[PDB]
Design a protein around this ligand. Sequence first.
Ligand SMILES: CCNC(=O)c1cc2c(-c3cc(C(C)(C)O)ccc3Oc3c(C)cc(F)cc3C)cn(C)c(=O)c2[nH]1
Ligand SMILES: CCNC(=O)c1cc2c(-c3cc(C(C)(C)O)ccc3Oc3c(C)cc(F)cc3C)cn(C)c(=O)c2[nH]1
Lengths: 110, 114
Amino acid sequence: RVTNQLQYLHKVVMKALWKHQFAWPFRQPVDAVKLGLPDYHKIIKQPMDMGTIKRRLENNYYWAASECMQDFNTMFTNCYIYNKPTDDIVLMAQTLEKIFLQKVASMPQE
Amino acid sequence: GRVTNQLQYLHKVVMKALWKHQFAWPFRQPVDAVKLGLPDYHKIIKQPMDMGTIKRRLENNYYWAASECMQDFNTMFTNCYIYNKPTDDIVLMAQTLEKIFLQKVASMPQEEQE
Ligand SMILES: CCNC(=O)c1cc2c(-c3cc(C(C)(C)O)ccc3Oc3c(C)cc(F)cc3C)cn(C)c(=O)c2[nH]1
Ligand SMILES: CCNC(=O)c1cc2c(-c3cc(C(C)(C)O)ccc3Oc3c(C)cc(F)cc3C)cn(C)c(=O)c2[nH]1
């Protein structure tokens, strides 16, 4: 499905987030083996990353805007829940999530 | 602060839907860390936020733009995810409310007026 809302999420929201200096830890799934995090997939049951969201927008996976917005939300929430409050990654996620919300405030109404 | 079409939608549509939700009660007022016996709360959460504060701010025309009110809702949810354990029920309550917040925000009027 291709709606004006999903087009905006792809061309405005994803475009702004993908290129952000803090985006690199979120562009691909968390490689728990490489990172040495054996409890990752035990705590995070729904892993999500921008690369998966990007691939989904490119292959018209979503039916509604709300579904893509929930995937961005899952990615940020996974980060806050798994990591320690003082981890830099939490600050990086918060910075990107603020941009996500600022952009979503201007999204088409459908 | 001013009265925009988007700020009106956040008050009459978004806040209206969230305030009355069965899972809203722990979010209607600030986290009472003294009553809860949580001495580390204000050490980890430096920007406390709750729906009651957001509601009072919408009622008193505190915000200049919808994006500012949306950031306060986001701070409230993020504070919950960061402070609590992954398995705490409060995290599930916050996630349920945040999904409604995002569903409602998707239907907000696109352009901000006055
Ligand atoms: C409880 C401890 N948690 C972690 O260690 C942890 C690490 C990570 C990473 C992450 C992913 C990658 C690649 C590109 C391989 O994907 C690379 C580095 C990453 O993190 C670091 C960052 C951002 C800066 C550093 F100086 C060092 C590291 C390790 C992503 N996400 C979303 C996480 O939630 C997460 N948690
Ligand atoms: C790591 C430990 N974390 C907590 O203890 C914790 C408690 C809380 C509360 C919260 C606030 C209040 C009042 C009105 C007094 O403020 C009352 C109960 C609350 O929680 C409970 C709920 C929802 C159901 C229960 F069966 C029991 C409790 C305690 C709110 N928020 C947003 C939190 O993030 C939070 N974390």
